[PDB]
Structure 1
Protein backbone atom coordinates (compact mmCIF):
# COMPACT_ATOMS: atom_id res chain seq x y z
CA UNK A 1 0.00 0.00 0.00
CA UNK A 2 1.20 3.51 -0.83
CA UNK A 3 2.37 5.41 2.24
CA UNK A 4 0.51 8.62 3.10
CA UNK A 5 2.72 11.26 4.69
CA UNK A 6 0.96 13.35 7.33
CA UNK A 7 1.65 15.58 10.33
CA UNK A 8 0.28 13.02 12.77
CA UNK A 9 3.17 11.98 15.03
CA UNK A 10 4.56 15.52 15.31
CA UNK A 11 1.25 17.00 16.46
CA UNK A 12 0.98 14.25 19.07
CA UNK A 13 4.53 14.95 20.26
CA UNK A 14 3.74 18.67 20.58
CA UNK A 15 0.54 17.84 22.47
CA UNK A 16 2.45 15.58 24.87
CA UNK A 17 4.92 18.43 25.37
CA UNK A 18 2.08 20.81 26.22
CA UNK A 19 -0.52 18.49 27.82
CA UNK A 20 1.18 15.27 29.00
CA UNK A 21 -2.10 13.69 30.14
CA UNK A 22 -4.52 14.49 27.30
CA UNK A 23 -5.35 12.53 24.15
CA UNK A 24 -6.72 13.59 20.79
CA UNK A 25 -9.30 12.02 18.48
CA UNK A 26 -9.03 11.20 14.78
CA UNK A 27 -11.23 14.06 13.59
CA UNK A 28 -9.23 16.57 15.63
CA UNK A 29 -6.04 15.07 14.22
CA UNK A 30 -7.36 15.55 10.68
CA UNK A 31 -8.33 19.14 11.49
CA UNK A 32 -4.84 19.79 12.87
CA UNK A 33 -3.23 18.28 9.77
CA UNK A 34 -5.38 20.43 7.49
CA UNK A 35 -4.55 23.53 9.53
CA UNK A 36 -0.81 22.82 9.33
CA UNK A 37 -1.01 22.22 5.57
CA UNK A 38 -2.99 25.43 5.02
CA UNK A 39 -0.58 27.57 7.05
CA UNK A 40 2.42 25.99 5.30
CA UNK A 41 0.90 26.70 1.88
CA UNK A 42 0.03 30.30 2.77
CA UNK A 43 3.49 31.11 4.12
CA UNK A 44 5.28 29.39 1.24
CA UNK A 45 3.16 31.17 -1.36
CA UNK A 46 3.77 34.55 0.25
CA UNK A 47 7.51 33.84 0.38
CA UNK A 48 7.51 32.84 -3.30
CA UNK A 49 5.68 36.03 -4.26
CA UNK A 50 8.16 38.09 -2.22
CA UNK A 51 11.10 36.38 -3.92
CA UNK A 52 9.57 36.96 -7.36
CA UNK A 53 8.87 40.65 -6.69
CA UNK A 54 12.52 41.46 -5.95
CA UNK A 55 13.76 39.51 -9.01
CA UNK A 56 15.48 36.93 -6.80
CA UNK A 57 15.44 33.17 -7.32
CA UNK A 58 16.07 31.84 -3.81
CA UNK A 59 13.87 31.48 -0.73
CA UNK A 60 15.82 32.43 2.40
CA UNK A 61 14.91 32.94 6.05
CA UNK A 62 14.32 36.65 5.39
CA UNK A 63 11.53 35.84 2.93
CA UNK A 64 9.91 33.47 5.44
CA UNK A 65 10.20 36.09 8.19
CA UNK A 66 8.57 38.77 6.03
CA UNK A 67 5.81 36.36 4.98
CA UNK A 68 5.16 35.51 8.64
CA UNK A 69 5.01 39.20 9.55
CA UNK A 70 2.60 39.85 6.68
CA UNK A 71 0.26 36.91 7.28
CA UNK A 72 0.13 36.30 11.03
CA UNK A 73 -1.84 39.07 12.79
CA UNK A 74 -0.61 41.02 15.79
CA UNK A 75 1.30 39.62 18.75
CA UNK A 76 1.19 36.10 17.29
CA UNK A 77 3.43 37.14 14.40
CA UNK A 78 5.95 38.76 16.74
CA UNK A 79 6.18 35.63 18.88
CA UNK A 80 6.44 33.44 15.79
CA UNK A 81 9.25 35.62 14.44
CA UNK A 82 11.17 35.23 17.68
CA UNK A 83 10.72 31.46 17.58
CA UNK A 84 11.99 31.38 14.01
CA UNK A 85 15.17 33.20 14.97
CA UNK A 86 15.48 31.09 18.12
CA UNK A 87 15.64 28.07 15.82
CA UNK A 88 17.88 29.31 13.01
CA UNK A 89 20.59 30.66 15.32
CA UNK A 90 20.61 27.31 17.12
CA UNK A 91 20.88 25.50 13.79
CA UNK A 92 23.92 27.67 13.07
CA UNK A 93 25.53 26.82 16.42
CA UNK A 94 25.55 23.08 15.70
Structure 2
Protein backbone atom coordinates (compact mmCIF):
# COMPACT_ATOMS: atom_id res chain seq x y z
CA UNK A 1 0.00 0.00 0.00
CA UNK A 2 0.82 3.71 0.02
CA UNK A 3 1.70 5.38 3.32
CA UNK A 4 4.18 7.81 4.89
CA UNK A 5 6.69 5.33 6.34
CA UNK A 6 9.57 6.26 3.96
CA UNK A 7 9.23 9.92 5.01
CA UNK A 8 9.48 9.92 8.81
CA UNK A 9 13.29 9.45 8.69
CA UNK A 10 13.54 12.39 6.29
CA UNK A 11 11.59 14.81 8.48
CA UNK A 12 13.33 13.50 11.59
CA UNK A 13 16.81 14.09 10.15
CA UNK A 14 16.09 17.83 9.89
CA UNK A 15 15.18 18.25 13.59
CA UNK A 16 17.11 15.54 15.49
CA UNK A 17 19.78 14.53 12.96
CA UNK A 18 21.55 12.35 15.52
CA UNK A 19 18.63 9.97 16.00
CA UNK A 20 16.78 7.08 14.38
CA UNK A 21 13.31 5.54 14.52
CA UNK A 22 12.60 1.94 15.47
CA UNK A 23 10.78 -0.55 13.25
CA UNK A 24 7.47 -0.02 15.08
CA UNK A 25 7.78 3.68 15.91
CA UNK A 26 7.43 4.28 12.18
CA UNK A 27 4.31 2.10 12.18
CA UNK A 28 2.56 3.89 15.05
CA UNK A 29 3.58 7.26 13.60
CA UNK A 30 2.11 6.25 10.25
CA UNK A 31 -1.16 5.12 11.82
CA UNK A 32 -1.36 8.37 13.78
CA UNK A 33 -0.76 10.50 10.70
CA UNK A 34 -3.34 8.45 8.81
CA UNK A 35 -6.10 8.83 11.36
CA UNK A 36 -5.49 12.52 12.06
CA UNK A 37 -5.51 13.15 8.32
CA UNK A 38 -8.78 11.25 8.10
CA UNK A 39 -10.15 13.31 10.99
CA UNK A 40 -9.21 16.63 9.38
CA UNK A 41 -10.53 15.42 6.04
CA UNK A 42 -13.93 14.32 7.31
CA UNK A 43 -14.18 17.54 9.32
CA UNK A 44 -13.54 19.63 6.21
CA UNK A 45 -15.99 17.45 4.30
CA UNK A 46 -18.93 17.73 6.66
CA UNK A 47 -17.96 21.41 6.94
CA UNK A 48 -18.22 22.08 3.21
CA UNK A 49 -21.48 20.14 3.26
CA UNK A 50 -22.93 22.64 5.74
CA UNK A 51 -22.24 25.60 3.44
CA UNK A 52 -23.92 23.53 0.66
CA UNK A 53 -20.68 23.40 -1.33
CA UNK A 54 -19.61 20.02 -2.69
CA UNK A 55 -15.84 20.54 -3.06
CA UNK A 56 -13.05 20.86 -0.50
CA UNK A 57 -10.67 23.81 -0.81
CA UNK A 58 -7.60 24.96 1.09
CA UNK A 59 -9.84 27.36 2.99
CA UNK A 60 -11.97 24.42 4.11
CA UNK A 61 -8.90 22.62 5.46
CA UNK A 62 -7.78 25.84 7.15
CA UNK A 63 -11.12 26.32 8.90
CA UNK A 64 -11.28 22.63 9.84
CA UNK A 65 -7.81 22.57 11.39
CA UNK A 66 -8.45 25.79 13.29
CA UNK A 67 -11.75 24.32 14.51
CA UNK A 68 -10.03 21.06 15.49
CA UNK A 69 -6.97 22.48 17.25
CA UNK A 70 -6.65 25.01 20.08
CA UNK A 71 -4.81 28.33 19.89
CA UNK A 72 -1.05 27.85 19.79
CA UNK A 73 -0.52 24.74 17.67
CA UNK A 74 -3.56 25.70 15.62
CA UNK A 75 -2.15 29.07 14.59
CA UNK A 76 1.28 27.55 13.98
CA UNK A 77 -0.31 25.01 11.64
CA UNK A 78 -2.15 27.82 9.86
CA UNK A 79 1.14 29.65 9.40
CA UNK A 80 2.82 26.54 7.99
CA UNK A 81 -0.05 25.89 5.60
CA UNK A 82 -0.15 29.47 4.36
CA UNK A 83 3.62 29.46 3.84
CA UNK A 84 3.33 26.28 1.78
CA UNK A 85 0.42 27.71 -0.20
CA UNK A 86 2.27 30.90 -1.12
CA UNK A 87 5.41 28.88 -1.90
CA UNK A 88 3.50 26.79 -4.43
CA UNK A 89 1.89 29.99 -5.73
CA UNK A 90 5.38 31.36 -6.45
CA UNK A 91 6.25 28.64 -8.99
What range is the shorter-chain TM-score in? over 0.9
Which runs of 5 or more residues in structure 1 are unaligned? Answer: none
Q: Which has the higher helix share?
A: 1
Let me know the Cα RMSD of the aligned residues. Answer: 0.8
> Once the 2 structures are TM-superposed, how far is the Cα of residue 74 of structure 1 from its aligned partner?
2.4
* Structure 2 residue 54 is the aligned partner of structure 1 residue 57: yes
> Once the 2 structures are TM-superposed, how far is the Cα of residue 12 of structure 1 from its aligned partner?
1.0
2:80: which partner in 1? 83
> Once the 2 structures are TM-superposed, how far is the Cα of residue 73 of structure 1 from its aligned partner?
2.1
Task: Pick the aligned partner of 2:32 from 24, 35, 49.
Answer: 35
CA distance in 2, matches of 1:34, 1:72: 19
Task: Pick the aligned partner of 2:22 from 22, 25, 29.
Answer: 25
Q: SS in structure 2 opposite 1:58?
A: coil
TM-score, with length taken from structure 1 = 0.92
* Structure 2 residue 41 is the aligned partner of structure 1 residue 44: yes
CA distance in 2, matches of 1:22, 1:83: 24
Which runs of 5 or more residues in structure 2 are unaligned? Answer: none
* Structure 2 residue 66 is the aligned partner of structure 1 residue 69: yes
TM-score, with length taken from structure 2 = 0.95
Moved over 4 A (4+): none
> Once the 2 structures are TM-superposed, how far is the Cα of residue 41 of structure 1 from its aligned partner?
0.3
